Symmetry: C3
Subunit: 183 residues, 3 copies
Amino acid sequence: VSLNQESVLRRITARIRQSLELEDIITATTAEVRALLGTDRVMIYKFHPDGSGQVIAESIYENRLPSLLGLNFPADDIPPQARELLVKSKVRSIVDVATGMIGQSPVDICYRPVDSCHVEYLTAMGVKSSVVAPIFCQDELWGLLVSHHSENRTVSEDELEAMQMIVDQLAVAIAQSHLEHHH
Amino acid sequence: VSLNQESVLRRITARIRQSLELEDIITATTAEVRALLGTDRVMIYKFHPDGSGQVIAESIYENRLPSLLGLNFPADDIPPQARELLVKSKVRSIVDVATGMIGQSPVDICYRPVDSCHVEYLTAMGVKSSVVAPIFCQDELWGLLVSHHSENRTVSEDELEAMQMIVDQLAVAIAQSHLEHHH
Amino acid sequence: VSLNQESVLRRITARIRQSLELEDIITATTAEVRALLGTDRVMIYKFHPDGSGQVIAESIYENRLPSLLGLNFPADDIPPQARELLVKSKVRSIVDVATGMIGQSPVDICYRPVDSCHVEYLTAMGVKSSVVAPIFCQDELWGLLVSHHSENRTVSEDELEAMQMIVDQLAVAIAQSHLEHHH
Ligand SMILES: *[C@H](C)[C@H]1/C(=C/c2[nH]c(/C=C3N=C(/C=C4\NC(=O)C(CC)=C4C)C(C)=C\3CCC(=O)O)c(CCC(=O)O)c2C)NC(=O)[C@@H]1C
Ligand SMILES: *[C@H](C)[C@H]1/C(=C/c2[nH]c(/C=C3N=C(/C=C4\NC(=O)C(CC)=C4C)C(C)=C\3CCC(=O)O)c(CCC(=O)O)c2C)NC(=O)[C@@H]1C
Ligand SMILES: CCC1=C(C)/C(=C/C2=NC(=C\c3[nH]c(/C=C4\NC(=O)[C@H](C)[C@H]4CC)c(C)c3CCC(=O)O)/C(CCC(=O)O)=C2C)NC1=O
């Protein structure tokens, strides 16, 4: 009755089989991910070659947060130091605005203070909880799966696993789409 | 001249050896644990079959916290995930109300943000520092050893060992009493 | 053209070669360390036999913090437990006043709640960030390299590393001087 990661995964696979445009698979998927995670705003963020990115998919619950769909963000938003952790360690990050702490899990979770710049960035958006897992296409960092919530909350390892399954599945989605649209 | 875990432990073994009533072994021990730890309120909490529990022993320092002796707390107070952590990992938890962080050590200490509900709960009791170690009888989770303090204070890994030795020694006390008092 | 730790290290070694008095090697060096770390106040603190210490070197940026040069601090300022971590574990500590957490790295970083007494001490000085690495002469704990900042700042593993190289290099300076001033 309540969705689980296995079924969300089954549907992404089904959409691959239909040879939907990658942008369509991602849009459809995002809605389900939000329902599964239960957070207020789930987004999928795709990187541009120069390091900047764009929100290409987004599912918000009852307008509890503003919509950033279609918007572009500069590369300075993610420092070299931060990006390196995404590329090399494939790190999942959890920011907790209330405590000013960030916990990172590479692929236990150790929490350390988060840079005040980043927390202000999140606060400006009206976010109190942020979870980010990187999406890849082979060895290429392709984007981010972003989960935002307007209120403070604890994040279990269960939730990190669910997110990892989804970004792992999207990698298959992306890689397959490239192969089918090979000239 | 002063108290160490070793002298406190010997007295428990002596009380086991002399077969004092278990409820007495527990009461006496609780008082010494408070003196050993130096905290304001140390309690021993025994679980009921349905998951709820009762404070069956308590030693407070200079009336600095209210007495909760004899009181029952519902099972909802300790969520499934929390209880699972107690049963499988035999986890020690340290709550720091000031920083909103909780540190857990399975059987180093990793700190993460603690659920706001639990912090509100402790604040309701007037507690700024809480240390909890689980008590077992054989494989069965029997109760908890609880240390509360009205003011903020840091809890060292040394102190967790002391608590761990005591709950290990109390397990022998409880186990032995069942054996001696078999009809 | 720009400053990094190797160039700073190289400069300490150069002063040794010129056989400068140790006090000169230390005074000169601190200014370069501050320039390297970019912090408001970098100090070198030397222990007295009785546990007390003295600020023997100091480099401040644009009078953003008061001068502590020449002042003495009692041994109670560094408790037995804290000093023990310095002696056996040779711990580098980072205190983040905003979150009230302290992160310690022995020779990864784990953050724990810092004692309220110490936070009050740093707040009284107007310090929001403090990074401390111990200096040794053979087995003897000789002093501390201290970095203070008037604002929230994050310390990376890399920066602890630069600092470790520096105290390791100063240790050679000190050890050499003892050898030369042996009767
Ligand atoms: C400070 C002046 C600037 C800055 C620094 C900064 N950013 C990060 C870390 C991250 N920033 C992002 C950016 C985003 N988060 C999102 O949810 C989105 C999409 C809406 C973006 C573009 C991300 C993903 C990170 C990584 C952290 C994480 O995964 O949550 C840091 C590192 C913080 C730390 O302490 O680790 C820093 C220092 N960000 C700015 O906007 C500034 C210009
Ligand atoms: C309360 C009884 C007193 C007290 C306790 C206390 N201090 C520390 C930690 C440290 N205190 C120092 C001392 C200094 N740090 C400095 O930057 C300076 C100025 C040169 C001094 C004199 C140090 C080095 C530490 C170690 C922590 C670190 O390296 O950053 C603690 C331990 C804190 C903890 O939780 O680990 C305690 C309990 N300090 C006082 O001043 C009180 C008299
Ligand atoms: C009097 C003795 C005593 C009790 C009974 C107690 C309850 C208690 N609540 C706990 C956790 C918890 N309790 C709750 C939730 C709740 N708790 C509530 O009372 C709410 C009804 C509810 C929020 C709606 C949660 C979420 C946790 C886990 C906190 C975390 O792990 O972040 C824990 C485990 C955390 C720890 O080990 O410190 C205990 C022992 N603590 C005590 O010292």
